[PDB]
């Protein structure tokens, strides 16, 4: 998530089980489902457990970078959304307008948000 280019560590048990004929023993492995992504929420010194707003962009136009980067247009959404996957992966920050400055940027990363109010 931090790097979409990175390969997982906890999700490798999902990857593991395809080279072997199915058995009840393999069925035991599958109860694990880790690989999870956190829902990003803005943070403060007192700990805010919700987001404020975010921008999301389905289609970039930039081919000078493999994924491009979300320009300042995105579809705006409100609080309380889990990280959006492919078909929604470029995620821009909407916090500038409330006189707050993001300290922790976003692209579609797993990372939580934190903001500073003037």
């Amino acid at each position: 998530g931090l790097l979409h280019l990175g390969k997982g560590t906890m999700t490798m048990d999902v990857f593991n089980d395809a080279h072997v004929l199915n058995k009840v023993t393999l069925a035991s492995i599958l109860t694990t489902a880790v690989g999870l992504v956190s829902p990003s929420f803005m943070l403060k010194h007192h700990q805010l457990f919700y987001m404020l707003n975010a921008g999301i962009r389905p289609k970039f136009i930039l081919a000078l970078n493999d994924e491009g980067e979300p320009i300042k247009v995105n579809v705006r959404v409100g609080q309380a959304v889990e990280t959006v996957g492919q078909a929604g992966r470029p995620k821009k920050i909407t916090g500038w307008i409330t006189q707050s400055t993001p300290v922790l940027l976003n692209h579609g990363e797993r990372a939580e948000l934190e903001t500073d109010e003037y």
Partner: protein, 384 residues
């Protein structure tokens, strides 16, 4: 620029796919396996030599059917019936046997050149934010067109039916045309586009069959978005008056009501209509629940044009001379197609020079040609 490496990388993925594909077909596609050999053998033993295209009128549930061949004679045909008794339906193309005509098999699909006009091969090289500007009346077209395809999950929290339909209306040149083509690049679902001047025909009876068709194809593929461009064209375009006229126009409208919503319960046909004659439409057309959020577009304001003009001049050569802000000053609530015709005509000034620089002079000059269009079909000068 500087994207050479990624294009080589894409190309490299292409080399590897072409390679392994080719060799896999060639000689190691091994048909020395019996589940390939034995299935084709006894399939060809009942299957022809001449395969006698027929047209299935209707079926009988005693393992028989009546076909009418385009050559002429009908036949009361049997059916070998390893082909799944109930998988074939009126309008099918069936394979008859060169001896006693039995339905050897069934062709899955066939098509018309009249649905070629409907369907599309295109993949626009413009994606959204080449519609940059008017960026809050475009949340009414990507929250009821794009989004329920992308997330039905949001509309499940609230429950009840998801959105259906839009009508776009406003001044011409304010982007209506490109709005429809921009959501279709995002969604990647069957994009049908049909002009309203082909829904108006000089022959009657085939008018309704065309209009009935669009949505029947559209429902047939599970997702589709049907762009009817110019439903303002149904009262202003008409050929002769003895096979056109009131009658032609009334019927087609009537057909569309059944199709658009009616009683068909056809597949997903998200509808987009462009129009600026919205009062030549029925009250059962502009009825709610076929239009859910309707979008009004008016001319941009001064600071909106700044958004529009910067999109258009990024593709062009620039200098420090160029000043966009004073081109905005001159125009006053005009369309973005006017702005777009200044930048297109600015390179026509550069073409005329055969000088590849674009300068503030080229943008100001084409500004005057653009304003020449507005007020010289006018002959008052000052408002009389």
């Amino acid at each position: 620029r500087c994207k050479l490496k990624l294009l080589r990388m894409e190309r490299i993925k292409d080399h590897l796919l072409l390679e392994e594909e080719f060799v896999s077909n060639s000689e190691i596609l091994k048909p020395f396996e019996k589940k390939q050999e034995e299935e084709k053998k006894q399939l060809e033993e009942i299957r022809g030599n001449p395969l006698s295209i027929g047209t299935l009128e209707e079926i009988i549930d005693d393992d028989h059917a009546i076909v009418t061949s385009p050559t002429m004679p009908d036949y009361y045909v049997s059916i070998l019936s390893f082909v799944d008794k109930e998988l074939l339906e009126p309008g099918c193309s069936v394979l008859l046997h060169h001896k006693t005509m039995s339905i050897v098999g069934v062709l899955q699909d066939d098509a018309d050149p009249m649905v070629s006009v409907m369907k599309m091969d295109k993949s626009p090289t413009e994606s959204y934010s080449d519609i940059g500007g008017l960026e809050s009346q475009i949340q009414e077209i990507k929250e009821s067109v794009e989004l329920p395809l992308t997330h039905p999950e949001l509309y499940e929290e609230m429950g009840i039916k998801p959105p259906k339909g839009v009508i776009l209306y406003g001044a011409p040149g304010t982007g209506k045309t490109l709005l429809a083509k921009a959501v279709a690049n995002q969604t990647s679902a069957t994009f049908l586009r049909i002009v309203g001047s082909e829904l108006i025909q000089k022959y009657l009876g085939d008018g309704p069959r065309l209009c009935r068709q669009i949505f029947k194809v559209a429902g047939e593929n599970a997702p589709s978005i049907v762009f009817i461009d110019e439903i303002d064209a149904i009262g202003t375009k008409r050929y002769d008056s003895n096979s056109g006229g009131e009658r032609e126009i009334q019927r087609t409208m009537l057909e569309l009501l059944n199709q658009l919503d009616g009683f068909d319960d056809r597949g997903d046909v998200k509808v987009i209509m462009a129009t600026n004659k919205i009062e030549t439409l029925d009250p059962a057309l502009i009825r709610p629940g076929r239009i859910d959020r309707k979008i009004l577009f008016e001319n941009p304001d001064l600071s909106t044009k700044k958004k529009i003009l910067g999109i258009h001049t990024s593709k062009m050569n620039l200098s420090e001379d160029v000043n966009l802000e004073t081109l905005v000053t001159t125009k006053d609530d005009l369309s973005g197609a006017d702005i777009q015709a200044m930048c297109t005509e600015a390179g026509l000034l550069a073409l005329r020079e055969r000088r590849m620089q674009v300068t503030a002079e080229d943008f100001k000059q084409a500004k005057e040609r653009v304003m020449k269009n507005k007020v010289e079909e006018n002959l008052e000068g000052l408002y009389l």
